């Protein structure tokens, strides 16, 4: 499929540009697609780690009608 | 919504601790934003060459064609391929 091949090449190029890398696209080996629905929560929370209180940002994709939850991002943003 | 957001914050910390083998001790929710999401999510396995070597990668790309929007949400080295 031309569409998937184009998305795959986008991913590599975008990875390259973001990380300053030189990956050379080879080929798509398999691909799935799904309709996105539900809600994306961006949550700032405090938790203790390394002996001190730290602030993290989490992005959680959830679909209530399935009890589906996926952590899509989790980063330390402050203390 | 407050219980819901608390339950998702706890899930986030649990999942982080599991993935990273970490020991975060949940404190509290500080703030939260939310947005309904739509469009299409593609999960792609691909091969690419890195220095001399061919490697296998998993990419996720979120697309919203009515906005010409594409976002790389994951790009992970998942396997090695023969020399």
UniProtKB/Swiss-Prot annotation, chain A:
What's in the keyword line of the UniProt record? Protease inhibitor, Thiol protease inhibitor
Q: Which domain of life is it from?
A: Eukaryota
Q: Does the keyword Nucleotidyltransferase apply?
A: no
Record flagged with keyword Iron-sulfur: no
Molecular functions (GO terms): cysteine-type endopeptidase inhibitor activity
Position of sequence motif Secondary area of contact? 34-38
Family indicated by similarity? Belongs to the cystatin family. Phytocystatin subfamily.
Record's protein name:
Cysteine proteinase inhibitor
What species was this sequence derived from? Answer: Vigna unguiculata
């Amino acid at each position: 499929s031309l569409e998937i091949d184009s998305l795959a090449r986008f991913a590599v190029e975008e990875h390259n540009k973001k990380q300053n890398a030189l990956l050379e696209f080879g080929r798509v080996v398999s691909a799935q697609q799904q309709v996105v629905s539900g809600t994306l929560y961006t949550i700032t929370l405090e938790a203790k780690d390394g002996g001190q209180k730290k602030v993290y940002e989490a992005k959680v994709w959830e679909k209530p009608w399935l009890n589906f939850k996926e952590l899509q991002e989790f980063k330390h943003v402050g203390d």
